């Protein structure tokens, strides 16, 4: 929570228009995008490119700001923004027939969220190196989300097609457990899966909901049992 106040303080200084602090804090230009995204709760591609440039503008010997950026990215509302952007990107990529590995904007979202989630590690020890991603998140976890989604939509299109005989097959409610292994081994995959659970709860499909409700019982860092996802 303190990190959020830090960002707020900076924006309050930006609201005061103090060039003595706006022009010296290199994360001020970063928090332009962070404010414009957190108000929307969505990272559009333009501000994504801007964030990519700000990360690329970090030179050697001044990498402490990355820790500050991770601290600034540890704000839970920013985690909400990045997780919902990832979930909605994965929701809209099914229509275009594009895998998560074929989504450079999504890869940038994964990069930024990974840099954000390791923030307390970067303050505890002064780590100025990027956290690494998971291959199976790109190739198994997110395509398993897509697998569930597009089975649900194929069932829906079948329902909207008439001539269904007696005792129709239910939506497949079996759970692939490598998905749950990634939930209970990767905080990244964990939190994005939690926000996927919240998003399908907004979609309120009981079949996929109770399909994935097993496996959420065991999750990484008790993030499925933390304040954020429980409150949402």
């Amino acid at each position: 929570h303190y990190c959020t106040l830090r960002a707020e303080l900076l924006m309050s200084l930006h609201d005061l228009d103090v060039g003595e602090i706006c022009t010296v804090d290199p994360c001020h230009k970063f928090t332009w995008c962070l404010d414009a995204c957190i108000r929307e709760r969505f990272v559009d591609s333009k501000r994504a490119r801007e964030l990519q440039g700000f990360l690329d503008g970090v030179k050697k010997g001044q990498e402490q700001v990355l820790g500050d950026l991770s601290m600034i990215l540890c704000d839970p509302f920013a985690i909400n923004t990045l997780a919902l952007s990832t979930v909605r990107h994965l929701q809209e990529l099914v229509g275009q027939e594009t895998l998560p590995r074929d989504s450079p904007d999504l890869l940038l979202l994964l990069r930024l969220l990974a840099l954000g989630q390791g923030a307390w590690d970067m303050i505890d020890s002064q780590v100025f190196k990027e956290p690494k991603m998971e291959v199976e998140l790109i190739t198994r976890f997110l395509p398993m989300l897509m697998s569930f989604l597009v089975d649900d939509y194929t069932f829906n299109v079948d329902q909207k097609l008439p001539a269904e005989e007696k005792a129709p097959v239910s939506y497949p409610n079996t759970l692939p457990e490598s998905f749950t292994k990634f939930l209970q081994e990767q905080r990244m995959a964990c939190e994005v899966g939690l926000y996927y659970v919240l998003h399908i709860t907004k979609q309120r499909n009981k079949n996929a909901l109770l399909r994935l409700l097993p496996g959420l019982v065991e999750t990484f860092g008790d993030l499925a049992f933390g304040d954020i996802f429980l409150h949402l």
Binding site: V94, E97, L99, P143, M146, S147, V150, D151, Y153, T154, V157
Partner: peptide, 12 residues
């Protein structure tokens, strides 16, 4: 491969 088969299954 499973997801692409799921896509072509949605197209049909």
């Amino acid at each position: 491969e499973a997801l692409q088969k799921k896509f072509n299954k949605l197209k049909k």
